[PDB]
Amino acid sequence: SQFPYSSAPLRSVKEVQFGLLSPEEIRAISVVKIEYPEIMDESRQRPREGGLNDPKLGSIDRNFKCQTCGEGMAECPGHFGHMELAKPVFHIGFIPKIKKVCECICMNCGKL
C-alpha cells in the first residue's frame, strides 16, 4: 500500500500467454533506436543520445528522472529499445527446432 495512487484498476493475473516477439511488435514497443557504440560524449556526464544508456530507456538514479515515464527510479519499470541488424541471425535456443522445420516443409515452395 506504499505505492503512489493510480487510477488504473487493480486485479490479479489469471492467464499467462507465451509466444515469440514479432519484429513489428519489437519495433512498436521500443522507444529509442540504439546505434552508437560509444557511451559517453566527451566524459562530462550527459550520456550519448541513442546509445546503450540513453535516458529514454529508464532512470536508475535520483539525480535525473526518466524522460519517458516521468517518475523516479522507485516507480519507473524501465523501457525497451530496438537495434536493427544488418543481416538475420539464428537464435541459439531455436537452432534444432528450425532444422526440424527444414525437414518438414519444402525449401522452394515452402510447402509440407
Binding site: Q17, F18, G19, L20, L21, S22, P23, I26, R27, I29, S30, I34, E35, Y36, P37, I39, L52, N53, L57, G58, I60, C76, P77, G78, H79, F80, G81, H82, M83, E84, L85, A86, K87, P88, V89, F90, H91, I92, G93, F94, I95, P96, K97, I98, K99, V101, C102, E103, C104, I105, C106, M107, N108, C109, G110, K111, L112
Partner: protein, 161 residues
C-alpha cells in the same frame, strides 16, 4: 524439386543435395524467406500459432535492448563507473553490426563478409547462451566467462530458484 538433407554443425546448418551431391550453407536470410511463405493452414498444422508463434520469428532480425534496470550500472572504485557483462556484450554486438554495415557498403571480399557475419552470430549466441557445447565460450575482458541470461535464469542460485 528434390529436398536437401540438413545437418547441424555448431551454429551452422549444412544442406546437402543428393543429385555427386552438393553441400552448401543455409544462410538465415534464405531460411527466413522460405519460412515467410508458409500458409496459415500449414503453420497451424505444424504446431505453430498464426497469431502468437510464427516460425519466421524464430530467426532474429531485430534485437530488443533491455532497460538499464536489467543491467544496473556498476562502480569498480568510487567515482569511476563500470559496466555489466550485458552492457559490454551489447556494445560488442552493436560494434559487430556496424562493422558488417560499414564493410557491406564498401567492397565485397566475400570471405571477409562470411567471417564477420559468423563473428556477429557467435556474439549474439553467446549473448543469449554462453554455455554452448562443442565450442569455446566467450570470455569477458578480465578473462572470466561472460555471464549470459541463460546462466542468470537456471541454476540453484539462478533467478527462478
Amino acid at each position: 524439386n528434390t529436398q536437401p538433407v540438413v545437418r547441424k554443425d555448431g551454429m551452422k546448418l549444412w544442406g546437402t543435395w543428393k543429385k555427386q551431391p552438393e553441400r552448401k550453407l543455409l544462410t538465415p536470410g534464405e531460411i527466413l524467406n522460405v519460412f515467410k511463405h508458409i500458409s496459415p493452414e500449414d503453420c497451424f498444422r505444424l504446431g505453430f500459432n498464426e497469431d502468437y508463434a510464427r516460425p519466421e520469428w524464430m530467426i532474429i532480425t531485430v534485437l530488443p535492448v533491455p532497460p538499464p534496470q536489467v543491467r544496473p550500472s556498476i562502480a569498480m572504485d568510487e567515482t569511476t563507473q563500470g559496466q555489466d557483462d550485458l552492457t559490454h556484450k551489447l556494445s560488442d554486438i552493436l560494434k559487430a553490426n556496424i562493422n558488417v554495415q560499414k564493410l557491406e557498403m564498401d567492397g565485397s571480399p566475400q570471405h571477409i563478409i562470411n567471417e564477420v557475419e559468423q563473428l556477429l552470430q557467435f556474439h549474439v549466441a553467446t549473448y543469449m547462451d554462453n554455455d554452448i557445447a562443442g565450442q569455446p565460450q566467450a570470455l569477458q575482458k578480465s578473462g572470466r566467462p561472460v555471464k549470459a541470461i541463460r546462466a542468470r535464469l537456471k541454476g540453484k542460485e539462478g533467478r527462478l530458484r
